[PDB]
Design a protein around this ligand. Structure first.
Ligand code: SAM
Ligand code: DTB
Ligand code: SF4
Ligand code: CL
Ligand code: FE
Length: 327
């Protein structure tokens, strides 16, 4: 077995399982694994690169203890602190991302879960966006209930984001206040609601190569539709502030095997894209088919949205959103 023929087999319908020799993806040649991942992406996704965007709808004060997170109240960081934003600020950002041609937009909230009056405020914001704007809609709100997921879906939200973060084995080393099992339960609810599930995690936090493979396999078993691969941005004041940043070859290997293991998913670049040369150009040629663009939650964009769209179009990818296709 070799990466080039294995990519052909997957194009022709083979699917990697937990019982396959996953160590192959660690020992095989990187450039061949990238080439094969790009071919799998071309066959299963095609040339569209889906671009999404986010707003930090509620910043800081989270009681959870995730070791990477700027917004955990267990850490003293530079993060802004505010309760759920006024609707006008959300609509301003939605309209801006639509003016720039982004495919979808998400409200992302710090906290264990968004509940009660602030949840109602989010719903109202989605109703206004669904009425006024053509850009598609996502939410990332923590451990919400099935009834809340249905309310989001009825208001026009089509994807729910809930990252597994790390492998099951490594999860207790990153967070003690909630569990990996709790993440999987939310994801099952997202699928039962008929929404797209967007779930990935963070690499470079000290997890092993085998943990990264287990993340990829676990998301494949769930049928996850969109998989954000964040490289750690070490945040000053958090426990992980002094971890070394990942190299481009290590990120590319990860993107590529996530593509082999999740051939039909959008493998999506997310935080840490500045670690890649040319703001991720090579990753789009190594299995990635989607990216978050523009500003993140407490850190700034690696480039403007326009720069990302021009880079992708110049390499021959399609970045025209559906709402700009008039005829
Ligand atoms: C989506 S959560 C917000 C909603 C909710 N509180 C939750 O945890 O599901 C924000 C996402 O940002 C990513 N993230 C946070 N801090 C990061 C960092 N320093 N480097 C890379 N990714 C990070 C994590 O993967 C996390 O899932
Ligand atoms: C929510 C978006 N979806 C995802 O998987 N990561 C994004 C957020 C990245 C945050 C990077 C660190 C920060 O800005 O605090
Ligand atoms: S639950 Fe979400 S906001 Fe809270 S510390 Fe963890 S990643 Fe950050
Ligand atoms: Cl756990
Ligand atoms: Fe603490």
């Amino acid at each position: 077995m070799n990466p080039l023929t294995l990519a052909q087999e997957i194009i022709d319908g083979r699917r990697i399982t937990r019982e396959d020799d996953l160590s192959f993806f660690l020992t095989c040649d990187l450039d061949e694994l990238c080439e094969g991942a790009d071919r799998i992406r071309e066959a299963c996704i095609g040339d569209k690169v889906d671009l999404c965007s986010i707003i930090n709808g509620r910043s800081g004060r989270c009681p959870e203890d995730c070791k990477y997170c700027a917004q955990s109240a267990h850490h003293h960081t530079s993060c802004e602190v505010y309760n759920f934003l006024p609707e006008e600020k959300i609509l301003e950002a939605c309209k801006m991302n639509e003016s720039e041609g982004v495919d979808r937009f998400s409200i992302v909230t710090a906290g264990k879960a968004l509940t009660g009056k602030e949840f109602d405020q989010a719903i109202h914001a989605y109703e206004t966006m669904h009425r006024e704007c053509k850009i598609d809609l996502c939410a990332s709100m923590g451990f919400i209930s099935a009834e809340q997921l249905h309310r989001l879906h009825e208001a026009g939200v089509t994807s729910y984001h809930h990252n597994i973060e790390t492998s099951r084995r490594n999860f207790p080393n990153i967070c003690t206040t909630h569990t990996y099992d709790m993440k999987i339960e939310t994801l099952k609810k997202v699928k039962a609601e008929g929404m797209c599930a967007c779930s990935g995690g963070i690499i470079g936090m000290g997890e092993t190569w085998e943990d990264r493979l287990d993340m990829a396999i676990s998301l494949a078993e769930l049928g996850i539709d969109s998989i954000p691969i964040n490289a750690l941005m070490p945040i000053p004041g958090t426990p992980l502030e002094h971890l070394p940043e990942l190299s481009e070859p290590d990120i590319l290997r990860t993107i590529a095997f996530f593509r082999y293991i999740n051939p039909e998913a959008n493998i999506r670049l997310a935080a840490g894209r500045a670690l890649l040369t040319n703001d991720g150009e090579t990753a789009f040629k190594a299995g990635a088919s989607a990216s978050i663009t523009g500003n993140m939650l407490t850190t700034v964009a690696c480039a403007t949205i326009r720069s990302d769209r021009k880079m992708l179009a110049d390499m021959g990818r399609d970045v025209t959103p559906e709402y700009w296709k008039e005829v």
